[PDB]
């Protein structure tokens, strides 16, 4: 009893519009109100509105009157929210939440769906292997790196040795270099591990079916 599925990430150009879905996976769908909350990067939560599927009734937070419109497919127990005349302020992560009786506590929440309102085009990344300069690293034996430069849609998957190497890694939040993003990761291994063995950073950018592999070769 409990599981809600939301859509994948979106990138819409200003002025455009999106329709996102939340699917009820295990309870009496038309028996509870569904809530939509907004959260901007590194910021707080804001209540949009709710709808009772059964009779399609709905309440809207004033601030989001012309911007929001809520709907739900009773046959498939799914909620829908559409946003209009999208702008830079509409870029945020949206959540769907189920209310219950009396206390009216939103028990289960959806995983969240990210929306980006931008004019940039999808670009692929550049993966450069960062080999150490003998001594330039302190203790913990050795540290290697992998720089990922110039990609636009934020999602990027980075791993070491297809996943076999997970201990001692650090992937840093991505930053925006004027229209583009850059990210970096490090792995600290023991001295007798590196040249003897092999370390490779695996990178894949979903928005451009790109899958690069960079073996850290010593200088």
């Amino acid at each position: 009893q409990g599981q809600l599925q939301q859509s994948g990430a979106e990138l819409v150009r200003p002025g455009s519009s999106v329709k996102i879905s939340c699917k009820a996976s295990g309870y009496a769908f038309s028996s509870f109100w569904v809530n939509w909350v907004k959260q901007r990067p590194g910021q707080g939560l804001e209540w949009i509105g709710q709808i009772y599927p059964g009779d399609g009734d709905n309440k809207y937070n004033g601030k989001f009157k012309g911007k929001a419109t809520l709907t739900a497919d009773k046959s498939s127990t799914t909620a829908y929210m559409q946003l209009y005349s999208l702008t830079s302020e509409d870029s945020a992560v949206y959540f769907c939440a189920r209310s219950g009786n009396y206390p009216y506590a939103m028990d289960y929440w959806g995983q969240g769906t990210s929306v980006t309102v931008s004019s940039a085009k999808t670009t692929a990344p550049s993966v450069y292997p960062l080999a150490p300069v003998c001594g330039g690293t302190t203790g913990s034996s050795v540290t290697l790196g992998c720089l990922v430069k110039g990609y636009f849609p934020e999602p990027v998957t980075l791993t070491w040795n297809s996943g076999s190497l997970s201990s001692g890694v650090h992937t840093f939040p991505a930053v925006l270099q004027s229209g583009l993003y850059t990210l970096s990761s490090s792995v600290t291994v023991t001295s007798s591990t590196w040249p003897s063995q092999t370390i490779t950073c695996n990178v894949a950018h979903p928005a451009s079916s790109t899958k690069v592999d960079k073996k850290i070769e010593p200088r």
């Binding site: 209540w47 959540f95 540290t143 790196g145 720089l147 840093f172 930053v175």
Partner: protein, 210 residues
């Protein structure tokens, strides 16, 4: 338009300490719910109707209040209690959330290990040069990083990023990248990454000569 103000906006506690967060409304409210949100995930119901613990929350948590003031309390802090806590009002319209409180887990001081990485031949082929520096596993977040080219400081073309407090050891890491044109790069000889942290009275430096 009931605005819920949360105090403090941010705070840290050593494990074992008692923590007390407060939520205050502009007008009487019948009850407050509380949610907890760890970085990168969807919020969880923590406490419903002021004092009823939700499902799975340990006994160290407790709430209370009436009218305009309500609060959350943890008898003894524990590493896994680190997150942002939101208080929520729903006895009006529109429904409102609180400003938020980020709770950090304290630990004994730890100094950063530095590493400097020169540009790669591949990027140079293309004609650009990015020099990277990793300041890893230090505790107090406050750290200052500077770059020096042949002794001169440079604050142009510098991009920084920080990780979230680590789960296994409660530490921090930071990355600093300086991007120059291959021209600017091969027109100099020394590159230095310099960090000033409390674990040391003098700045720590790492450098390489091109």
């Amino acid at each position: 338009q009931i605005v819920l103000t949360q105090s403090p906006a941010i705070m840290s506690a050593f494990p074992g300490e008692k923590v007390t967060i407060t939520c205050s409304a502009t007008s009487s409210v019948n009850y407050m719910h509380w949610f907890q949100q760890k970085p990168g995930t969807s919020p969880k119901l923590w406490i419903y109707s002021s004092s009823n613990l939700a499902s799975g929350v340990p006994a160290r948590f407790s709430g209370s209040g009436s009218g305009t003031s309500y609060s959350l309390t943890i008898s003894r802090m524990e590493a896994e209690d680190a997150a942002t806590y939101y208080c929520q009002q729903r006895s009006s319209y529109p429904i409102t959330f609180g400003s938020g409180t980020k709770l950090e887990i304290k630990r004994a001081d730890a100094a950063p290990t530095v590493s400097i990485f020169p540009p790669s031949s591949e990027q140079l082929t293309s004609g650009g040069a990015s020099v990277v520096c990793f300041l890893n596993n230090f505790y107090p977040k406050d750290i200052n990083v500077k770059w020096k080219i042949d002794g001169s400081e440079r604050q142009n073309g510098v991009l920084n990023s920080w990780t979230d407090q680590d789960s296994k050891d409660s530490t921090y890491s930071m990355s600093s990248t300086l991007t120059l044109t291959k021209d600017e790069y091969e027109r100099h000889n020394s590159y230095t990454c310099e960090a000033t942290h409390k674990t040391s009275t003098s700045p720590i430096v790492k450098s390489f000569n091109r």
